[model samples]
Target: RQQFPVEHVQLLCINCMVAVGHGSDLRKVEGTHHVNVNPNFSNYYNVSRDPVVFKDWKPGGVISCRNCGEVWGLQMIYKSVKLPVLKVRSMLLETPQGRIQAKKWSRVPFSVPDFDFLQHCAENLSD
Candidate 1:
């Protein structure tokens, strides 16, 4: 085996340096982000009361670092799944290789499964 640990990495805000979520949940849903739209996520990230205005696609609101107020990402509204996705451009991934600045979750150095839309069907797609 070439040897690559499937262990999860905590993706952090590039500016605030707080844990966004385990990289396992990282996937490209709308704009690509670590999906943890649970109400408890408010403990870390603060969302704007006014949702982002979109013409065609469905975007919920702006998500920022609770402490630093850096807009790290946005909340996505995919069908019934109104989930929050992170912007890799705004996140930093620390690894043995160095740091991961992959804009798309699909481009991460580590292995992450595809966005499970099925399992998400029975989930909390929130902002």
Candidate 2:
């Protein structure tokens, strides 16, 4: 359940078929699902997601492709850890030669690293 391979591939936009980033850009987190581990991913998308309301875990803005205005996913902020969570159905995966699309992340051919909240807090956040 918590053991995804974390392999790298071409993360594409399902709607416009644009490569948002390499598969390595993806990281798995609990609430919002997959997050783009790269900070510059915002540079590629070229936009910031709007702040969303939530309880203990505050969800961030929704990320979309600026190339074609395709809605990708939202961000989830759990405690001191902030993540830009992506939508599975809104994106596609590319490997070897062709591409693969799935309704959910569990069905993808590759795996992704889970967001390490404690690790992030230790490295970035301190009391």
Candidate 3:
């Protein structure tokens, strides 16, 4: 297993406040790191008809948040094991100090995902 920085923390979906996974779940890939979370951690809705399959590749489909309709990631079935592959760019981090940030305060590359819905949700809170 690869060693992740101790500063790494838990990842959450800013949309519905769902616990997607931990920062340690991130694995380094070419030019980026992808988060491999368990399917149970997230509530997903299939955006496409059935599961889409790539030729000679693992079968998977676009997975969006059932709560906020945000296109979060994909669910892939590899060797019959379901894996939730999330875009790290679409996640939030909870630190030990109890603050939610768009990215970790370290060498790791983290950024806030598209969240035009944030303003809409905020407006609804007062209703």
Candidate 4:
């Protein structure tokens, strides 16, 4: 059986803890997991990633925090699908109270608009 679990927290860049997207926004592609984030969500740079393809490729460079320049995840462009993808390992999970490791997180419920990247990936990944 395939497990498609939804996490109850938003994922942020470890450096600034800026909101990138939610755990529910991630999609599993093969053994790797990807999140479709807005261009403004996180900073994409060519600091350190393998092969360093300037143009769009299958697996691309690193996505970092704009404020602190910390490596957050890997960027991938699936030509067969829509939108670029960010492959992440672990992210800063924010609780309902808006705390990382949530000593006093809130239940206020926060949300970011789903962009073309997220919306298109959701449809493609479902199949």
User: Highest lDDT, which number?
Assistant: 2
TM-score of each: 0.70, 0.75, 0.51, 0.51
The global Cα lDDT (0 to 1) of model 4 is: 0.49
Candidate 3 global lDDT: 0.50
Worst 10 residues of 3 by lDDT: 111-120
Q: Give the per-residue lDDT digits (tens) of candidate 1, residues 1-127.
A: 1223435456677887767556655554434345653445657777786764333247778888987898877777665455566777887876656556666656666775556677665654542
Residue 2 of model 1: what lDDT? Answer: 25
The C-alpha RMSD in Å for every predicted model, in order, reads 4.1, 4.1, 13.5, 9.0
Highest TM-score, which number? 2
Tens-place lDDT per residue, model 4, 1-127, is 1122345666676557767666565444442344554333544333356545324347656656665676655666656543335533335666654544322112113332333444565456443
| Model 1 residue 115 lDDT score | 63
lDDT of each: 0.63, 0.70, 0.50, 0.49
| Model 3 residue 92 CA deviation in Å | 0.8
Model 3 lDDT tens row, 17-115: 666566654543222335353334644444443554322226466767676776767755533544455664566666564535444333433332222
TM-score of 1: 0.70
* TM-score of candidate 4 relative to the true fold: 0.51
Worst 10 residues of 4 by lDDT: 102-111
Model 2 Cα shift for residue 64 (angstroms)? 0.8
Off by over 4 Å in 3: 1-8, 27-33, 37-39, 42-59, 97-127
